[PDB]
């Protein structure tokens, strides 16, 4: 049944090279047959124990698609691949967005900046390998430190215009949790006008409807595209016209952590002092911004609906944003860690593994099979585990790792798993799942 | 410390293998060997089996799709449209001259050892551990290809042992897999080339260190044998009369004995025709005896035979140990032979970095610590020896080879061969059967 | 969630147990149930100790061999001085006063047990070869000191327990088989009619109180009756055959002796022992391999035991049927058939088994009892023995699969004497020394 | 040559059980034939993977030697052994120290408080082992919480009389680094008067004089014994008469850590709030007291000679005390980390392993074989590695662990190793070296 550690690490590496199109790795074989932004950070993490040179290539490809205003788009499309919707033709960024790259097709929205974490792992691997391998990673810093700064500066200046230290989203897809209950009350206020016809491609691949978002949800995902296109993806116009404007507390906590990670890399590798100062200021700002959202009793973080001007209260894994980035008073972080481990999340009596369900099994929003409405996601298990280790919670990080691997031992490298039975769901051969396994072992 | 952990090493080896995959064939190395080779493809299938039984099966189906009509599996199946290797499809000219060559694969004109039954066994053993749909894939490969395998073994037995001596005749040193072994030096010394059409080497464009590859003089004789074969359209019935090189390869013969027995047990387990299993056992036994008849009375060491000179070939290489693979030596001679293996002419030599088997003894005048088959340590041989020893029931001795094999492989170079004293990787890096050996041990 | 130990955790725990059962120069088979040294547990303890300390492993066998009777028999228990909790103890065997051949300076039992000792010597020697010159010297010193002793142990089996030269070992007590209550011995035991049996109190079922896991009182009455029988003739080898109510040829023991003989012969060649001994060992290796083959079913290859009193073959469905797999000898077709029986649904392939492992009794036999000692449970000592013999036949994958599943089963860390075939519940004594030894060797 | 991880773990547990005298483990089979206080904490850490029950026994036996005033004596002598000097007779503690326990026989001095760390490791193993094992550890808490509090309160109140946040030592033996260059200048002002004759036993067992302190140093060590003896070991009278009085900044940092670790336990298991508040108070006082020693450029921590009233500058592993407990400003800590890597320590070109030598190889006090004057000590690698992981420095802690296992892969379980050749030194079969390996793999 279950593969040994060497078998599993081999089958994961075999998977990662098999999803490699040449200079970009698709996020899955068929369902996501393109380069996605946060997956590509994870693919670089997974590739770094295999080939520092090729992990660097993965980040160099994504950054070559960076928008002129600094935004890393959430998709970089593979030349001449179909199979996915909405494709280049639906976004029309090449024709409508003055900031879109001249020589890459890309989407029009962003995604969380996990990228600095991938740079850290590459550097830590490279330092354990040759002098020539350190030279490759250090040359990659020399080449892309500016691009990474523009990425972080664009988030902080253009998606936190009021310096609240939370990132604004104009599309639920930018959160990475497309159908999370976090966004349900925001989406209920999105009223599509004349929606141009389309046919989904995702549920041609994953045909079980219980596992993917609904048609109605997709009608709202694509309407938001029309609103964006109408204004040519102009940052200065989105606030006026978008029917979806939310402050994503999970994305912001990730941003806080990334700025700190990048700042320490800037210190270690003698990057400009003004950059490190900006990174540290953003780190602290978005840490404070996460904490301001948090429940008084449990420390759980809240999303904010900018249009409705109300806190979003749901019971998902994003409530734990503050654990990633710190800043909660000591007492309230204990409360939060107890919520994490208690029967609403990791301690629910029915879970096969001691892992974080995307939505709490006790919430009325919970759906054991439905994407971000409850399944266990290895990508989140890794991110939480790496961030916990970084907080100095060595044992808590080890247990996540240990259950992560045990769940991963079937070798399906599933996109997500059913919380109660462990059945693999979503795409098989999902690249960032294989990256998580490879980072934990490699 | 430059060394990888076991999971790091197994991952890099799998990443290597998929990186050498052109689609339905795996090249034997990135650049040096940018096509499918016959016995490398067997090992690649062994290395692939823990990754994907389905894709391991594809590798063997691809090689068998290039099998000649008389049953010979040629030693190269060229990739469509690939240069960078000489002699290429144009030099062999089998596409136009060999009546038996396949109509839809480009291939070489010579054969290579029948390690393929061993890969089938590993595929079947992995597939039996991975559930019903995976066993079905392996079983259906057996249904499609049992005949081809039988024709492969029957061509060796009937066409390369036409006197029923139990030893496989070669017409080219390349068929042994040890191109420049000291095994063939006296045979090659009697190969006088005629008007050899000019050519330029490709191999030493990629491996430029001349100490690591054969000499121009050796290549001149390698290509001349091609010419003798070409002039006769690769016709099995003409080769004995015209070939300037005709040797009995005791190591190939021992492999064939082991393969016949492996294939026969597979035939029994999977209800293949009884008459086929009988044939396989008969050949196993005959080639076991033929290997033994070559052996030294004191040490048990096996000898190759020069058919043209009518001479036993006495050299000090790892092929001497052929009878260890296939058994049959009287108990006391096999003890002497193991004593030779473990003592200072070979594994116990005091200057070796690892307890592994050099391709030529470091005490032989023929020894060269960098030169291909004239001394370096070859991971493919470590694996074959280790797998065969385990099968003999020598669990500990098979374990020690495996252990030292992994230590040597832990630089991650997956080199084709290593310098015996310093451990320096030599030949092509990223060599597919070295990666396969690592995967098999840990997979 | 996961109550399993990692391999390094399990290995550490196994070595920790093994050291805790060490009384100084002998290891107890278990902490409480078996608080003395057992002959074939001692061979496995030495196997377990070789990756930790070749010196202490050599000491364990030295102590055992210091208990060897004057005629060569290795008795199955060497009692720890002054320790109780086990019955029958030295006061009941009375061997210091009744057996002319007991050792002057050791309290021991008066029966024997299978000769796995040579396998333990092979494992010792293999480890010491890997450790360096000083360690190889310790192991070689042990061979100079003990080779004659080992030969006398083997020659006593060959001459005094195979007197008609049939290639099979006669036992006078089921305890000598190592499988006390195996179904194998039920019909022979049915002909043991106790007489005046001096009263006694069991100690084993005070430690293991569950009666579903141990032999019955009536079996113990028959066990203690045979003691009275051989005690009545001063444990005299020449007198035993005319007075013992239990006289069986053990085919499993016989195959083990065949293996041992070959193993010890090969040690003898490597270490230049007297040529006369090696030839004798090769003679016994062949004689007992043939004597094991002679028992086998012409269709299935299954080996049978023999009741020499009833003059009847013992057909039962226990792990012992597979004795020919350990020693070789069967014709090709007979051995393929036997393997089919082993992996088929009557044994390792039974659909309700938790692990792919050999149950001591076949789950489809009417004699099957899933908890009751040797009438069904999975014994890690048998899994190791089968695995190590399998690898030695060259069945690399077959032996790997048993080891793999043996480690899965032991990965609970109980180091149980035996496991429930269906639920995997640990049964028997916890902290059983040879179960710890199996894990250590599979990983050390 | 080198053992596999499973072999080395089996051999480490073998050694540990063989040094078990029943309810106490000897720090080594012959050189240290009694129980030592921080060895005992490390033994409990090494036993936790094998037997939480037996690990709890180890600390019960230690705390049963706890003096009436709270002090944990640094040696609990085994009944009957006489192969070590100074023994029961030379300490005269069972007659001269009014706080020495009844029925034990202990030293008259203390050793660093690593014990809370052993308690946390025990609790972490127990939480992964199920309900009965948890109960064992939580019953140890109820039994021993007051005793641990008393051990911390004695150090805070009686060894920090001026509330300076640093521990005062009256014997170099109390640092665990007997002949560290750290103490040379304080020892040089110890003039031994009428020293009763004695014979060392330590150099009977370890014959090479290059690996053990000199006779002149043992004279000072046995003279400090006479001073506290002549005053009946009375806390109130020691400062008036002791001619060796140093603040030990490494010990101080360990206390800081221990206090924070025991505070967190106290919160987790609902101990009285007053103890938790006090522990957090001491953790901060000693964190501050450690930071107050440090060089404003490098961050290197200094010890302080109370009699001479001057800072003790040496280049030993102790300089890195602040890395354990936190506190330093960001720039100073970066500077101190560069000192720890880099050529004067872990980064020295001639080191066989990337490990921290007890003395800088570039110090003029360096001696590659001489106890604490240079060699690499597996106890310090474990301590540094575990504290590093607690700071969130996952990779740094992983490199020491990796190198520490590679060095221990000989299976000698040596007390210390030659930094350049890797030669095993000191006592072989040293219990806390075996414990370090077990925890790193248990």
Numbering used by the authors:
A (entry chain B), D (entry chain D): 5 to 446
B (entry chain A): 4 to 446
C (entry chain C): 3 to 446
From the paper:
While the active site of GH63 members acting on larger substrates is located in an open, solvent-accessible cleft, those of MhGgH and of MgH from T. thermophilus are covered by a cap domain (subdivided into A′- and B′-regions) with constrained access through a narrow negatively charged tunnel. The crystallographic structure of MhGgH revealed a homotetrameric architecture, which is compatible with the oligomeric organization of the enzyme in solution as assessed by SAXS.
Despite crystallizing in the same conditions, selenomethionine-substituted MhGgH produced monoclinic crystals (space group P21) that were used for structure solution by multi-wavelength anomalous diffraction at the K absorption edge of selenium. The largest interface area (∼900 Å2) occurs between molecules A and C (interface A:C) and molecules B and D, and involves 14 (A:C) or 12 (B:D) hydrogen bonds. With approximately half of the size (∼480 Å), the interface between dimers A:B and C:D is stabilized by four salt bridges. The smallest interface occurs between molecules A and D (and molecules B and C), with a buried surface of ∼260 Å2 and a single hydrogen bond.
